[PDB]
Design a protein around this nucleic acid. Structure first.
Ligand code: MG
Ligand code: ZN
Ligand code: ZN
Length: 395
DNA sequence: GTCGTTCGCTACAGGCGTCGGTCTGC
DNA sequence: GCAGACCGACGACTGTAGCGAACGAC
């Protein structure tokens, strides 16, 4: 069976999130969006575990289900060097053991969903491999809290320890990450690290796996690529639409080149801020080889359908008209990815014509894109001739 | 025209380093 | 005067009350 999954969210116990990020709301949004599996997130917080046990019924000992949506134990933790790390747990006993093992190295583990662990990346990876916990550098290209912002390679970060995956993130895709030779030996993950159950947030990126049943062991075998199970697709947001794609400032959000950044010593002239290095320039810095493996699954660049509808209707992202159109589209069809890539444009025209034309322009890459960086999302704009034309003469 | 209905922009929140400025002891 | 210690503020880690203001069936 083929299943879509996003394995990186945060509960309402974390910071800078929404109070609507609870199990029922997340399950409803995932079921209405077209998502089969969802990572629990913040599994080290005991209150979140209590809410999971209350608002759900278990499948086995490491996979749960609520409102027809499966859930596996995941969590993001912070490093002593301030490096985000994503962890996947086999069962709940592993969660309890890992929690009780790091209480002496933390102070907010029992309070916040995203705990601060006073441990080294090598130490965290070793403790994870000790309990068969899957570990990866989550959004490892962010110039704020990532792996490549502090360390220069995976070996320098983990040392003798090993990992199991590597989250690409918003501003990255499979190819630019595969521009590193060592990355050829590690599977990729395209998650969201989303904080809101909004359509353009929850499940903006996901991974499509081929499995037999829906449990932790099947996901583990699909990640390791054994027993017929495998990760067959990585649906991700276009790298240009990320928050930190290009090297830009953190205050006025002005894009600068790497050469000008080094010349100005990372000091914004007409703003007085600290310009942060984008993921593209960081990857070009750590460029290793121009080759990439064949077994690498494809990465279909998709844009959030909510933002497409918002830019077509000429209204905001959280307005009522765009919500109505998005809900009618999800009712008439399947999921977001279906309308974004798979569904033909003549079928999309049955619900709305302008949205169909915009999706055609996105598939044909004629959609104008201005990249983002420093904390500002990338922006999309459709030309006027694509709007004032029909569908027949379009192609 | 009318008065509920909805938009879009601004402010602010809640809990570990980095970056300047300032004090101290020499 | 100055190296080094001490201090405060600032923001990721985004989401959303909320509030004039434009809107849209009567
Ligand atoms: Mg991406
Ligand atoms: Zn994170
Ligand atoms: Zn600036």
């Amino acid at each position: 069976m083929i299943v879509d999954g996003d394995l990186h969210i945060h509960s309402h116990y974390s910071k800078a999130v929404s109070k609507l990020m609870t199990f029922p709301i997340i399950a409803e949004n995932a079921k209405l969006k077209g998502l089969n599996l969802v990572g629990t997130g913040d599994s080290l917080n005991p209150h979140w575990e209590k809410e999971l046990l209350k608002h759900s019924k278990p499948i086995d000992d490491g996979t749960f289900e609520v409102n027809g949506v499966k859930f596996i134990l995941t969590c993001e933790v912070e490093d002593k060097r301030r490096v985000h790390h994503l962890l996947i747990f086999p069962t709940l006993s592993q969660v309890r053991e890992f929690r009780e093992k790091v209480k002496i190295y933390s102070t907010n583990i029992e309070s916040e969903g995203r705990p601060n662990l006073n441990l080294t990346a090598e130490e965290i990876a070793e403790m994870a491999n000790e309990l068969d916990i899957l570990i990866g550098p989550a959004h490892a290209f962010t110039p704020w809290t990532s792996l490549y912002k502090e360390y220069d390679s995976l070996k320098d970060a983990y040392g003798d320890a090993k990992i199991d995956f590597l989250e690409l993130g918003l501003s990255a895709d499979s190819d630019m990450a595969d521009m590193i030779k060592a990355h050829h030996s590690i599977p990729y993950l395209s998650n969201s690290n989303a904080h809101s159950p909004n359509p353009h947030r929850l499940g903006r990126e996901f991974n499509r796996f081929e499995v037999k049943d829906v449990t932790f062991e099947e996901i583990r075998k699909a990640i390791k690529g054994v027993g017929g199970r495998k990760i067959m697709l990585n649906a991700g947001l276009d790298p240009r639409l990320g928050k930190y794609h290009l090297t830009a400032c953190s205050r006025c959000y002005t894009k600068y080149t790497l050469q000008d950044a080094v010349s100005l010593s990372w000091k914004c002239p007409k703003c007085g801020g600290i310009i942060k290095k984008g993921v593209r320039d960081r990857i070009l810095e750590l460029a290793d080889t121009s080759e990439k493996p064949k077994d690498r699954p494809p990465y279909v660049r998709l844009a959030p359908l909510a933002e497409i509808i918002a830019m077509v209707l000429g209204k905001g992202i959280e307005s009522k008209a765009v919500k109505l159109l998005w809900n009618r589209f999800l009712r008439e069809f399947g999921s977001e990815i279906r309308v974004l890539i798979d569904l033909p444009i003549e079928s999309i025209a049955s619900v709305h014509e302008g949205v169909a034309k915009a999706i055609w322009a996105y598939r044909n890459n004629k959609l104008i894109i201005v990249p983002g960086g420093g904390g500002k999302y990338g922006e999309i704009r459709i030309p006027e001739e694509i709007l004032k034309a029909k569908i027949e003469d379009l192609n």
